[PDB]
Amino acid sequence: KKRQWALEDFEIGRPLGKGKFGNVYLAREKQSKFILALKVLFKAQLEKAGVEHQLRREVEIQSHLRHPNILRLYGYFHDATRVYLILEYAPLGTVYRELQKLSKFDEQRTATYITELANALSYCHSKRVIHRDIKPENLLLGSAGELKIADFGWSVHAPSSRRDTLCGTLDYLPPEMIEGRMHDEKVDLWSLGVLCYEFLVGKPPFEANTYQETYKRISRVEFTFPDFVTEGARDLISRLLKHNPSQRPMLREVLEHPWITANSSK
Numbered sequence: 001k002k003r004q005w006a007l008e009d010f011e012i013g014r015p016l017g018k019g020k021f022g023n024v025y026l027a028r029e030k031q032s033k034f035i036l037a038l039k040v041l042f043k044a045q046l047e048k049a050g051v052e053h054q055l056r057r058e059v060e061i062q063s064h065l066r067h068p069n070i071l072r073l074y075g076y077f078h079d080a081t082r083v084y085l086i087l088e089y090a091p092l093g094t095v096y097r098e099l100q101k102l103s104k105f106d107e108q109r110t111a112t113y114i115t116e117l118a119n120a121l122s123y124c125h126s127k128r129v130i131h132r133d134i135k136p137e138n139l140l141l142g143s144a145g146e147l148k149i150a151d152f153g154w155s156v157h158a159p160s161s162r163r164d165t166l167c168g169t170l171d172y173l174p175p176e177m178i179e180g181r182m183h184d185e186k187v188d189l190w191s192l193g194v195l196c197y198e199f200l201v202g203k204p205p206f207e208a209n210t211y212q213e214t215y216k217r218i219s220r221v222e223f224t225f226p227d228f229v230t231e232g233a234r235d236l237i238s239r240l241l242k243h244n245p246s247q248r249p250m251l252r253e254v255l256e257h258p259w260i261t262a263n264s265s266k
């Protein structure tokens with residue numbers, strides 16, 4: 001990607017999503033009539049967080065990833081007030097909204113999303129990229145209904161030492177992360193297990209009223225299953241949520257899991 005863009009090249013449309021830093025907009029590039037999404041971040045907002053460098057890492061990382069299950073970053077640009085990220089547009093919205101709607105998914109839709117996810121995380125990890133923010137408000141759906149990892153804000157290079165006052169919120173964070181320790185690609189395997197549970201049950205398995213209690217649930221790995229969660233599903237999830245990262249499966253074993261294979265349409 002070569003030429004420099006600017007706001008004047010784009011017609012901005014419907015707001016897709018909101019945020020403190022800024023909003024995501026449907027937009028159309030005037031010359032090609034190309035439909036995409038523009039994420040607009042205020043320079044004056046993001047300096048306060050010291051995240052300007054993590055934004056630069058998010059941009060560097062996401063633009064260099066090519067995967068059907070990862071949301072493209074085409075490029076970026078800035079001006080006086082704000083910063084613009086030029087994104088692939090995922091027409092069906094977030095997995096979060098799907099989940100609010102259906103209230104929870106079935107084993108076939110779940111195992112398929114888990115498959116699209118695992119495939120994507122394989123790609124990333126081969127590049128030694130850890131996501132660490134994996135969660136349904138960060139996951140989008142393409143035209144065909146396929147899962148796409150969207151928001152790379154917290155992704156990092158592996159391994160990582162990071163204690164970040166926010167690496168993005170507790171329900172999806174593994175014990176080694178919340179406890180401020182060293183971590184690796186095993187982080188996303190835990191998160192995959194949290195997500196798998198949220199898909200079937202409709203709520204993350206560590207959910208609680210306060211951060212302090214959720215913190216307790218995570219570090220103690222305290223979760224229970226509703227009667228309707230099948231043993232195959234229980235088994236994969238129990239395999240993924242392990243306090244000891246090294247006892248978590250490789251994505252290969254995830255993709256090869258009996259319940260995944262019996263269920264995934266992909």
Ligand SMILES: O=C(O)c1ccc(Nc2nccc(Nc3ccccc3C(F)(F)F)n2)cc1
Binds near residue numbers: 089094097
């Ligand atoms: O109508 C909708 O609700 C709708 C329709 C299409 C969408 N598709 C879409 N495409 C690219 C980026 C993007 N950002 C975004 C927006 C809102 C929330 C989360 C994100 C994420 F995931 F990128 F961070 N959303 C998003 C939302």
